[PDB]
Structure formats: structure tokens, C-alpha cells
Amino acid sequence: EPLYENSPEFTPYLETNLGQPTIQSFEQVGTKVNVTVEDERTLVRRNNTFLSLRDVFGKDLIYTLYYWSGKKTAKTNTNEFLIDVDKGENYCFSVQAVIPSRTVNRKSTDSPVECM
Amino acid sequence: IVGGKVCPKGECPWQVLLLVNGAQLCGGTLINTIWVVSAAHCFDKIKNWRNLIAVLGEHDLSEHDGDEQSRRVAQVIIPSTYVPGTTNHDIALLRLHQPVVLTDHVVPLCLPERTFSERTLAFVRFSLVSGWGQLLDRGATALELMVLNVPRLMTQDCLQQSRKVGDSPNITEYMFCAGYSDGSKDSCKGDSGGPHATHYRGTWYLTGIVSWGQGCATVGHFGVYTRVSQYIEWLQKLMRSEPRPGVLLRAPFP
Amino acid sequence: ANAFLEELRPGSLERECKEEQCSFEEAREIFKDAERTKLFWISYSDGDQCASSPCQNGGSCKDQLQSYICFCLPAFEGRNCETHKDDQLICVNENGGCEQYCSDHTGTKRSCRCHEGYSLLADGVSCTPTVEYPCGKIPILE
Amino acid sequence: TVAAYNLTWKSTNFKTILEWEPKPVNQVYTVQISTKSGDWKSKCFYTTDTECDLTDEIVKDVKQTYLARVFSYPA
Ligand SMILES: C=Cc1ccc(-c2ccc(C(=O)NCC(C)C)cc2C(=O)O)c(C(=O)Nc2ccc(C(=N)N)cc2)c1
Ligand SMILES: *[C@@H]1O[C@H](CO)[C@@H](O)[C@H](O)[C@H]1O
Ligand SMILES: *[C@@H]1O[C@@H](C)[C@@H](O)[C@@H](O)[C@@H]1O
Ligand SMILES: [Ca+2]
Ligand SMILES: [Ca+2]
Ligand SMILES: [Ca+2]
Ligand SMILES: [Ca+2]
Ligand SMILES: [Ca+2]
Ligand SMILES: [Ca+2]
Ligand SMILES: [Ca+2]
Ligand SMILES: [Ca+2]
Ligand SMILES: [Ca+2]
Numbered sequence: 219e220p221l222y223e224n225s226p227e228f229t230p231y232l233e234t235n236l237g238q239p240t241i242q243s244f245e246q247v248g249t250k251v252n253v254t255v256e257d258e259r260t261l262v263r264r265n266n267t268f269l270s271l272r273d274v275f276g277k278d279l280i281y282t283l284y285y286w287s288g289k290k291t292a293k294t295n296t297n298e299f300l301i302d303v304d305k306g307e308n309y310c311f312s313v314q315a316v317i318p319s320r321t322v323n324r325k326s327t328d329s330p331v332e333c334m
Numbered sequence: 335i336v337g338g339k340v341c342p343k344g345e346c347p348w349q350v351l352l353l354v355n356g357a358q359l360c361g362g363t364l365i366n367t368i369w370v371v372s373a374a375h376c377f378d379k380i381k382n383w384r385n386l387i388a389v390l391g392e393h394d395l396s397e398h399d400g401d402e403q404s405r406r407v408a409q410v411i412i413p414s415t416y417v418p419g420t421t422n423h424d425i426a427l428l429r430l431h432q433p434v435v436l437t438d439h440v441v442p443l444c445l446p447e448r449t450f451s452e453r454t455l456a457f458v459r460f461s462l463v464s465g466w467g468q469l470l471d472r473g474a475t476a477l478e479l480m481v482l483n484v485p486r487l488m489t490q491d492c493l494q495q496s497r498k499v500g501d502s503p504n505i506t507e508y509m510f511c512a513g514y515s516d517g518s519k520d521s522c523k524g525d526s527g528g529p530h531a532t533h534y535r536g537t538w539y540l541t542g543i544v545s546w547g548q549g550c551a552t553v554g555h556f557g558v559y560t561r562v563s564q565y566i567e568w569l570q571k572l573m574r575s576e577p578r579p580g581v582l583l584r585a586p587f588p
Numbered sequence: 589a590n591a592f593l594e595e596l597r598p599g600s601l602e603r604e605c606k607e608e609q610c611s612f613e614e615a616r617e618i619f620k621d622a623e624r625t626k627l628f629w630i631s632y633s634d635g636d637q638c639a640s641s642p643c644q645n646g647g648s649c650k651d652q653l654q655s656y657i658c659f660c661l662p663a664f665e666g667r668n669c670e671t672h673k674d675d676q677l678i679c680v681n682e683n684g685g686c687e688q689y690c691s692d693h694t695g696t697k698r699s700c701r702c703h704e705g706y707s708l709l710a711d712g713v714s715c716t717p718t719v720e721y722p723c724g725k726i727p728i729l730e
Numbered sequence: 731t732v733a734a735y736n737l738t739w740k741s742t743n744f745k746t747i748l749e750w751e752p753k754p755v756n757q758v759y760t761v762q763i764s765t766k767s768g769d770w771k772s773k774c775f776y777t778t779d780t781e782c783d784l785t786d787e788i789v790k791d792v793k794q795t796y797l798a799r800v801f802s803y804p805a
Contacts, residue, residue, distance in 0.1 A: 219488055219489055219490065219507070220731075220801045220802060220803055221731050221732070221733045221801070221802045222488070222490065222733065222734075222799050222800060222801045222802065223733045223734045223735060223737060223750070223799060223800055224491070224737070224797065224798075224799045225737040225739065225748060225797060225798035225799060225800070226737065226739065227795050227796070227797055228739045228741070228746075228788075228795065228796050228797075228798070229793070229794070229795045229796075230741065230744055230746065230788050230789075230792040230793075230794075230796075231792045231793050233739070233741060234741040234742060234743065234744050234746065234792075235741060235742040235743075236742075236743070237650070237652055237657065237742055237743045238631070238651070238652050238653055258650075258743065259650070259659065259743070260743045260744045261657075261659065261743060261744040261745045261746075261785050261789055262744050262789045262792060263789065266662065268659060271743065274744075274792065284627075286624065287620075287621065289623070289624075310619075310624075312627060327630075327653050328627060328630065328631070329631070330628075330631040330632070331627055331628045331631070333601055344726070344727075344728040345726055345728065345729070347726060347727070365723070366723070436720070436721035437721075437727075438727040438728050439728075441721050441723070441724075441725065441726070441727060442723045442724075443723060443724055444703050444722075444723035444724035445723075446703075447689055449679075450683075450688070450689050450690070453679065453680060453683075453690075454683045454690075457762070457769060457770035457772075458769050459764070459767065459768065459769055459770070460767075485767075534683075535683075535687045535688070536687065536725075537687075537688065537703070537715075537723075537724040537725065538723075538724035538725070538726075539724060652742065655742070657742055657743055657745045658745070665783045665785060665786050666783045667747055667781065667783055671783065676775065678775060680760070680772055680775055681772060681775060682771065682772075
């Protein structure tokens with residue numbers, strides 16, 4: 219028998235790192251701003267099509283938004299935030315993927331910061 | 335077999351029963367119409383090399399039906415390297431006096447090539463082991479052929495994972511571990527000589543022989559099987575060799 | 589960037605860290621608070637590890653923090669999609685797709701064989717019985 | 731021949747890479763992967779590398795636990 223070594227066990231769904239999110243866009247509707255997070259593709263393929271992180275985790279996945287003098291936060295179980303803002307003030311935004319149910323590797327890294 | 339199920343009549347058709355003057359001795363495995371593979375240690379204490387019968391198509395030891403065929407064992411071939419009262423090189427090749435007749439109930443297990451076995455069969459996790467041996471370590475033997483699914487381990491993992499014990503023989507390269515274990519668990523006394531059979535892409539191969547264990551189910555212990563892949567060339571060379579005149583024959587290995 | 593002027597013009601993050609490319613202070617001339625500056629700086633200063641075009645064989649590169657991910661066309665794998673799956677048809681790889689025996693040949697393709705009592709079909713990998721009771725089949729289920 | 735060591739899983743968005751030491755000297759590696767009750771599947775055959783992409787296996791079912799092992803052979 220050849221010399222061999224065993225690896226640690228690995229459960230992808232629980233242990234794969236979440237990648238860096240990006241912000242697709244933001245739009246204004248009077249006092250309200252819509253922030254859309256890009257669906258990040260995974261290497262899971264359903265029939266010659268790469269699935270998104272939402273397609274794989276569904277309701278297990280949430281996105282957090284930091285915006286801004288401190289910081290405010292918003293959560294969404296979709297890819298969209300609808301936030302209230304003050305008129306004539308310019309805001310900056312950043313998002314983080316979170317899987318609350320996890321014990322390790324719960325949070326992605328923060329997205330690039332975008333500003334109005 | 336401990337913790338196994340009945341093998342439905344016909345579904346373990348290469349199981350052999352060996353008797354010496356009517357008494358249950360060991361299991362065996364039919365590999366063609368005249369040749370049976372068993373364990374060397376099964377023959378250590380024989381001295382009636384003509385009271386030695388093979389039975390094929392057996393199921394229920396307590397009723398004789400039309401599927402049973404009996405044959406006299408003409409010859410028992412073991413390695414010269416085997417040593418009675420030890421565990422290494424624990425394999426026997428048996429020539430039947432007349433052929434068996436192949437039926438829905440009596441079919442050989444395929445002996446594989448060495449490389450196929452080492453490179454492919456070795457990495458199929460679960461294989462079946464079967465016999466009429468003890469249902470419990472203590473306990474009694476089975477009347478109906480019993481069968482069990484066991485997972486294979488590489489020796490490094492078998493050592494690192496077996497509970498350590500003062501006077502257990504070494505696992506050699508002519509052996510491989512079962513079983514896991516955890517007590518549920520395994521095979522047992524009286525199953526010896528019987529097959530460890532591996533399924534692959536629609537066909538069944540002999541990969542092992544029931545040999546020994548530290549008792550049964552074996553807690554912290556695994557079943558140990560003869561690593562058939564090491565003996566394939568030796569089996570093939572003897573199966574084409576010319577019958578010697580004695581019953582017991584020690585042929586050189588390798 | 590900052591020309592003779594330019595800078596005359598007050599702090600923008602436009603036309604100053606992005607239509608051009610900024611130093612860590614042009615970045616706090618702007619954000620003032622520093623969780624906030626670090627937060628911007630982490631991603632800004634990281635750079636595109638995908639610029640070196642590491643993904644081969646038609647793969648697409650997605651940028652990460654101090655790393656990347658290659659997405660591969662189906663016949664490829666590897667960190668950089670460097671591995672042709674089609675060149676891996678060797679007997680150690682799932683027995684070569686052979687149903688029974690596999691034979692490796694340097695110079696040429698792997699060839700499949702069958703046990704006594706079977707012969708090889710036309711598809712080149714499948715075995716079929718040439719006798720009534722071949723080894724290793726259970727008649728009462730076949 | 732030396733056993734590989736420091737077997738490490740690198741995974742991001744299911745892109746899953748096994749890494750180990752050491753750099754091989756007159757020895758090559760083969761990798762095997764299975765589920766807890768499945769067959770061992772061979773990957774990255776006779777490589778001189780110290781990594782193996784296992785993405786294509788693990789994405790078959792992301793909820794399974796997998797075990798891997800690295801084999802050392804002399805050249
Ligand atoms: C290699 C030497 C060796 C020698 C004799 C015996 C032996 C001793 C006594 C009896 C017995 O009590 N009589 C009943 C029978 C004859 C009908 C039977 C056997 C036997 O051959 O199986 C065994 C032996 O127990 N093998 C064995 C096999 C598997 C496991 C397991 N997987 N746990 C544990 C043990 C091994
Ligand atoms: C392309 O650049 C990456 C990092 O940006 C490097 O790791 C690769 O070797 C190169 O081909
Ligand atoms: C990025 O993804 C890979 C898989 C290919 O489809 C490329 O053409 C695409 O741009
Ligand atoms: Ca009977
Ligand atoms: Ca400028
Ligand atoms: Ca400037
Ligand atoms: Ca601009
Ligand atoms: Ca400019
Ligand atoms: Ca400054
Ligand atoms: Ca400036
Ligand atoms: Ca300045
Ligand atoms: Ca980057």
C-alpha cells in the first residue's frame with residue numbers, strides 16, 4: 219500500500235467561503251433609495267448554467283448593507299434594499315453576504331464602497 | 335455472521351460449504367466448475383483427506399432440496415509459506431473430483447486480474463461476506479446462509495483506529511481489514527474460508543477470504559481477510575498445473 | 589492625480605480616486621472618519637488579480653480579495669482551468685470507463701477487455717456474456 | 731517517499747482546491763475523494779503539483795461531507 223495522508227472532512231454548504239459581493243446599482247425615488255446587489259455566480263452548475271449564491275442557499279442567505287456621523291445597517295432576504303434617506307445628502311454604501319445559521323465562515327468580505 | 339441478513343435462496347450462489355465426515359468445517363468460494371477457494375487454516379487439523387466434501391447450492395442446512403450438489407475434494411493446495419497456527423498466507427485452492435453443474439442456483443464468482451483488483455476493486459467501499467458461522471461471538475451457528483455488507487479499510491487506517499492489544503498478529507500485505515466495527519459490528523467463527531465479494535459495473539469478483547479477527551463484532555477491532563489480489567498469479571498457475579498424487583499439497587509461493 | 593491646480597477644486601471621489609487613481613490621504617481629504625477609510629481602502633488598494641488573465645481555455649475570471657476564481661468550460665478543470673478532462677482517459681481514472689478490464693498503452697488510447705465468458709461490444713467498453721452461466725452474475729435476478 | 735502534510739481545503743463559492751506540502755522530490759501524487767459511504771474516486775493523477783481541483787466532484791452534491799487523501803509514489 220502507498221504512503222498516504224487523510225484530509226480534514228469538508229462540507230461545502232457549511233464551509234465554502236462566501237465571495238466578495240458587488241453592488242450592481244442604486245436608484246432614487248424621492249426620499250427612498252433602492253440598492254441592488256449583483257447575484258454572484260458559484261461553480262455549482264445546473265445544466266450548463268452556473269447557479270447564483272441565492273439559487274444554492276435561498277433563504278439561508280442574507281445581505282447586509284452599511285450606509286452613512288456613524289453607520290446605519292439594513293438587511294434583506296432578497297438582493298435588494300429599500301432604504302429611507304435624507305434629501306440633498308450624499309450617501310455611501312457597502313454590502314456583506316451573511317449566512318446567519320453558520321458557525322464558521324459566517325460573513326463574506328465587504329463589497330467595494332459606492333457613493334452618490 | 336453477526337448482524338447480517340439471510341441471503342435469499344439463490345442470491346449467494348457461489349457460496350460453498352465444506353464438511354469433514356458430515357460435520358461443518360468452513361466456507362469456500364466457487365471460481366469455476368472444478369475449483370474452489372478457501373482458507374488454509376481450515377485444514378490444519380484434518381486427518382481424513384477423504385472424508386472431505388464440498389457442497390454447492392446449499393441454503394438451509396436442515397433440509398435437502400434438489401439444488402444441492404455434493405463433490406469429493408480431490409486436492410487441497412496451500413502455500414509453502416503458510417504456517418499452521420498462524421494467520422499469514424491464509425488461502426487454499428481446492429480441486430473437485432468431478433465438475434459441478436452450473437444452474438440458477440450454482441454459479442462461480444469471477445477471479446479478477448491482479449491490476450484490476452488493486453487499481454479498481456480495492457476502492458469500492460462495500461463488499462459482501464457470507465456464511466453459516468456464529469450469529470454471535472459467545473453463540474450458535476446459522477442454519478440459513480447469512481450475508482453482510484462490510485466497508486473496506488486501508489491498513490494504515492485499520493491500525494490507527496483498531497484498539498491496541500498485547501498479542502494481536504501483525505496485519506500483513508497479504509491481508510486487509512472489515513467491518514467498520516463498533517461492536518453491531520461483522521463476520522465470525524465458522525465463516526472462515528468464505529467469500530468477500532465486490533460488485534463493479536454489473537459483475538461480482540472475489541476480493542477476499544474470511545480469515546480471522548480479535549473474536550467477533552469485533553469492539554475497537556476489525557475483521558481481517560486474505561488479500562486475494564496477491565495470490566492471483568499463483569492461483570492461475572496452479573489451476574493449469576498437473577494433478578499431484580497426494581491430497582494435501584504445499585506449492586511454493588511465490 | 590493632482591496637477592498644477594487641480595486640487596483648487598475641492599475633494600471629489602469621481603475625477604480624483606476613480607476617472608484617475610488616488611493615494612491613501614486624497615481618501616481622507618474625503619471620508620474623514622477612519623473605520624470608513626479602511627473600508628474603502630481594503631477593496632480599492634487590492635487590485636484586479638484577474639488582470640494577469642490566469643484563467644485558460646476560455647474560462648472567466650472573477651476578482652476576489654487577494655485571490656480569484658476561474659469558472660471553466662465543461663471539458664476543463666483546475667485552479668486556472670489548465671486541465672483537459674479529455675486527456676485523462678487512463679485506467680486509473682474510473683477504470684477508463686471500462687466495464688471490466690482496462691489496459692493502458694503509452695502512444696495510444698486505453699483499450700478495454702472482458703473476463704473469460706464475456707466479450708466486448710462495439711461501443712468499446714461494455715461486456716456481454718458469451719455463455720449461459722458466466723462468473724459473477726446472479727441468474728435468479730437477471 | 732514522504733507522506734504529504736498540511737492538507738488544506740481552499741474553497742470560495744464552491745471552487746474547491748485541496749493543497750498540501752511538500753514540493754515533491756522524485757515522487758508524484760495521486761488524490762482520492764469520497765463521501766462517507768461512497769466509492770473512492772481518483773483525481774489529479776501522478777501530479778508534480780501540490781494542489782488538486784476537486785470542484786467538479788463536490789458540486790455534484792454540496793450537502794455531502796467529503797474526505798480526501800493524497801497518495802505518494804516514487805517516480
Ligand atoms: C487463522 C486461524 C484461525 C483458526 C481457527 C479459527 C476457528 C476457531 C474455532 C472455531 C470454532 O469455534 N468451531 C466452529 C467451526 C469449526 C464450525 C472456528 C474457527 C474458524 O475457522 O472460523 C479461526 C477463526 O476464529 N476465524 C475468525 C474469522 C473471522 C473473525 C471475525 N471477522 N471477527 C473471527 C475469527 C481462525
Ligand atoms: C496572473 O496573475 C495572478 C495574480 O493576479 C497570478 O497568481 C497568476 O500566476 C498570473 O498568471
Ligand atoms: C465566462 O465564463 C466561461 C465559463 C465562458 O462562458 C466565457 O466565455 C465567459 O465569458
Ligand atoms: Ca440443505
Ligand atoms: Ca485630479
Ligand atoms: Ca488630486
Ligand atoms: Ca467620474
Ligand atoms: Ca483627471
Ligand atoms: Ca491630505
Ligand atoms: Ca485631493
Ligand atoms: Ca490633495
Ligand atoms: Ca481583487
